[PDB]
Design a protein around this ligand. Sequence first.
Ligand SMILES: CCC(CC)(c1ccc(OC[C@@H](O)CO)cc1)c1ccc(OC[C@H](O)C(C)(C)C)cc1
Lengths: 12, 242
Amino acid sequence: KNHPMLMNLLKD
Amino acid sequence: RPKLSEEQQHIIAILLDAHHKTYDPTYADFRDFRPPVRMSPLSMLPHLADLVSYSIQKVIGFAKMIPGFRDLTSDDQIVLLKSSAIEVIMLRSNQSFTMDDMSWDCGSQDYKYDVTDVSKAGHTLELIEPLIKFQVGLKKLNLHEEEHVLLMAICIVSPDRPGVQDAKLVEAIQDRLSNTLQTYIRCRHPPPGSHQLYAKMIQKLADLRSLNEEHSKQYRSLSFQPENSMKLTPLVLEVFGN
Ligand SMILES: CCC(CC)(c1ccc(OC[C@@H](O)CO)cc1)c1ccc(OC[C@H](O)C(C)(C)C)cc1
């Protein structure tokens, strides 16, 4: 949606 | 008479440890990347794809730790990282780059990389030439580690990256970082090294925009063939494009 992997590595 | 405040010593202490936590000077994880091959139509693609992929993860880990970056929306976090990643990787690679023979020496001969290896990942001199040039002139600046982490953080938190929504927020974070770096050079970088140092650092950021553009172009050419694209990583494909 559309950057899952990057989003997950950014998460707190 | 400008001094380094408590907040600025804090910022520098944070970025140092952030860097220490995300850069391993023993290069120990390299043994997990698909192996290097030197005989070859793109024989370095799988090893360097893996190396870049890893590098992306560590750049994200450092970015998360930048004072104020966490305040950004997750959409601007994403935009800043997608557009800076290759740039920050070029800058952080400087730490292992050796003018001795214009190569990147990550511990051992297998992980010492030079112009022919980048060639074998599918890159041409259009990029490699100004890339070595960059490394050479960034190396000659002889940054204190403090200046190096701040240059990387300033690069990540750039207001003019395409797609930025809260540009004004990106600017206040970056300015707080510029200011820390300027004040730092003044107080801690002795002459003749300190001379125009800031302007020369800011100039390496402009050189980065150009390297970025040329990297992107050749990456788009590389990933034309779904056969090359097969040998990348999911993280590389997500971050660099598809
Ligand atoms: C080999 C030299 C260089 C220089 C920045 C490079 C050098 C060292 C790097 O990591 C070192 C630290 O991150 C480890 O802690 C990362 C990159 C590069 C790589 C790959 C590269 O291209 C690969 C190509 O873009 C593709 C398709 C594999 C992504 C270009 C340049």
